[PDB]
Ligand binder design. Structure first.
Ligand code: HEM
Length: 105
């Protein structure tokens, strides 16, 4: 898995960044699919969410290692994705965010 993070601060970053397009609640989809239970989940499977062609076809499984790269440069990991976030350059913010994602299960 990815570098060690802080879920408390991760919640803070989730709710100041991710929350603009996603939710941390199960099954509740907005502009983006719910991130509840995302860790370990296969891409494009959140019920009722309208995924892009790229995401569905990806064949990605959201492990910590992958989420770490993706959050940094989404287009590099899912070329053609419709997730508009330029990316998170701070590696510690990415580890904290993932740390928080991990509790959502
Ligand atoms: C916050 C820093 C943040 C995270 C974390 C995040 C994650 C994420 C994942 C893991 C996916 C794929 C999940 C799956 O396959 O089910 C995904 C997808 C979308 N996102 Fe995202 N995302 C974060 C931030 C943001 C922000 C700020 C926006 C909106 C400006 C956004 C949007 C989207 C969209 C749309 C998708 C679906 C992509 C597609 O089908 O191509 N995310 N995000």
């Amino acid at each position: 898995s990815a570098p060690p993070g802080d879920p408390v601060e991760g919640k803070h970053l989730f709710h100041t960044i991710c929350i603009t397009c996603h939710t941390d609640i199960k099954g509740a989809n907005k502009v983006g699919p719910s991130l509840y239970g995302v860790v370990g989940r296969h891409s494009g499977i959140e019920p009722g969410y309208n995924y892009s062609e790229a995401n569905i076809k990806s064949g990605i499984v959201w492990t910590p290692d992958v989420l770490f790269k993706y959050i940094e440069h989404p287009q590099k990991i899912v070329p053609g994705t419709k997730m508009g976030y330029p990316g998170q350059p701070d590696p510690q913010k990415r580890a904290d965010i993932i740390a928080y994602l991990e509790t959502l299960k």
